[PDB]
Nucleic acid binder design. Structure first.
Ligand code: ZN
Ligand code: ZN
Ligand code: ZN
Length: 89
DNA sequence: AGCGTGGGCGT
DNA sequence: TACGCCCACGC
């Protein structure tokens, strides 16, 4: 296929074009969590999710609302997406 | 609301 | 292989 990296775990049929994508996926089956927060010691399956988790400790909110007169800002881009959607609907 | 944790995707 | 990015769903 164009998706040679197939998951063979029991009752899973997912396949991927990339072996690293498959490796990340399989952590949902094994429970493996390689990335640990240095502040609170919680462990995470993914590096990017550790990174956004750490902002919960610092209050860093790099994503600011663009709506005039709005002061809201957010830790993650998707929070801001939801928020912008809210303003116009 | 805030944030866990998958996906496709880029580099 | 490393690390994320945005998108999205689900509490
Ligand atoms: Zn699988
Ligand atoms: Zn933490
Ligand atoms: Zn706003």
């Amino acid at each position: 296929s164009e998706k040679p990296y197939q998951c063979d775990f029991k009752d899973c049929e997912r396949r991927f074009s990339r072996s690293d994508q498959l490796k990340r996926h399989q952590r949902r089956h094994t429970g493996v969590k390689p990335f640990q927060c240095k502040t609170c010691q919680r462990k995470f399956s993914r590096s990017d999710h550790l990174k956004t988790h750490t902002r919960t400790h610092t209050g860093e909110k790099p994503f600011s609302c663009r709506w005039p007169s709005c002061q809201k800002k957010f830790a993650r881009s998707d929070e801001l997406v939801r928020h912008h959607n809210m303003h116009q609907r």
